[PDB]
Write a protein that binds this ligand. Structure first.
Ligand SMILES: COc1ccc(C(=O)NCC(N)=O)cc1
Length: 284
């Protein structure tokens, strides 16, 4: 029974290696990675791979791995798929920990924009969780942490992390991670998956997929939101993506809204993540 080697980049930046039968469905690998991570609240997470166009794709757990990675390497990342709007509701501290690791990468990468003060506050909770109480012996006036906190580090930011870290004496790791999450969950781009698109007129927009619905950034700023309950049908055709809106009160007809995606694969990918968010957040 022939087995394929799988390499998974974990959220701590380390590499998990395992073997699965070459006809294995994604769920098989996901279950192995989640057992490795001692993760029981698996519903929020998934594996990504890179397609032939180097685009991130979710590995569908119901479909054969070989029919998704196709001609590419069996290389994956473990990632948060559904960002919970209220992480305090999660049953396990270890789930909140993995969510913290994902968000730290969201921040350093620039996917999750953050004010100076929030970068320093989030940083100070990470430092408290991982090193415990502030110690002056490790940190002089010229201290720079090994921890990556921001897309661009400044001495000012390092100083503010330390100033807030001092305020957190006695804080336990789960407590610091919960504080991290109470701040992160409020950021305007928390759990927003962004997709480049054009509107029905050809103007460049971003579509954001998240718990609260489909967001349109017709400018650099948000300009429209469609709450999932208002969406009856998500569809794609060629390079186009469509949402069927419920009729407003006393309106005779549903309304259909159309967007142009970079290519057919990008339209299909956007359709699938919207359907998945719609289902997940309808049930949560
Ligand atoms: C709409 O709800 C969904 C939709 C999709 C998933 C999913 O693919 N998770 C990752 C995995 N490998 O199991 C989980 C729940």
């Amino acid at each position: 029974p022939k087995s394929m080697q799988c390499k998974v980049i974990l959220l701590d930046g380390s590499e998990y290696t395992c073997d699965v039968e070459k006809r294995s469905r994604g769920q098989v690998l996901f279950d192995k990675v989640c057992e490795h991570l001692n993760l029981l609240e698996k519903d929020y997470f998934g594996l990504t791979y890179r397609d032939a166009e180097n685009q991130k794709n979710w590995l569908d757990p119901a479909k054969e791995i070989k029919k998704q990675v196709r001609s590419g390497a069996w290389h994956f990342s473990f990632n948060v798929k559904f960002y919970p709007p209220d992480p305090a509701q999660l049953s396990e501290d270890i789930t909140r920990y993995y969510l913290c690791l994902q968000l730290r990468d969201d921040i350093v990468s620039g996917r999750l924009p953050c004010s100076f003060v929030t970068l320093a506050l989030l940083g100070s909770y990470t430092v408290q969780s991982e090193l415990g109480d502030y110690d002056p012996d490790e940190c002089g006036s010229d201290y720079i942490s090994e921890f990556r906190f921001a897309p661009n580090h400044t001495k000012e930011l390092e100083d503010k992390v330390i100033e807030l870290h001092k305020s957190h004496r006695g804080m336990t790791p789960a407590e610091a991670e919960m504080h991290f999450l109470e701040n992160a969950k409020k950021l305007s781009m928390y759990g927003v998956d962004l997709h480049h698109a054009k509107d029905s007129e050809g103007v460049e927009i971003m579509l954001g997929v998240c718990a609260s619905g489909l967001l349109i950034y017709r400018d650099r700023l948000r300009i429209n939101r469609f709450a999932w309950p208002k969406v009856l049908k998500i569809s794609y055709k060629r390079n186009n993506f469509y949402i069927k809106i419920r009729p407003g009160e006393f309106e005779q007809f549903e309304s259909t809204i159309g967007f142009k995606l970079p290519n057919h694969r990008a339209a299909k990918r956007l359709w699938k993540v919207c359907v998945e968010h719609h289902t997940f957040f309808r049930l949560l």
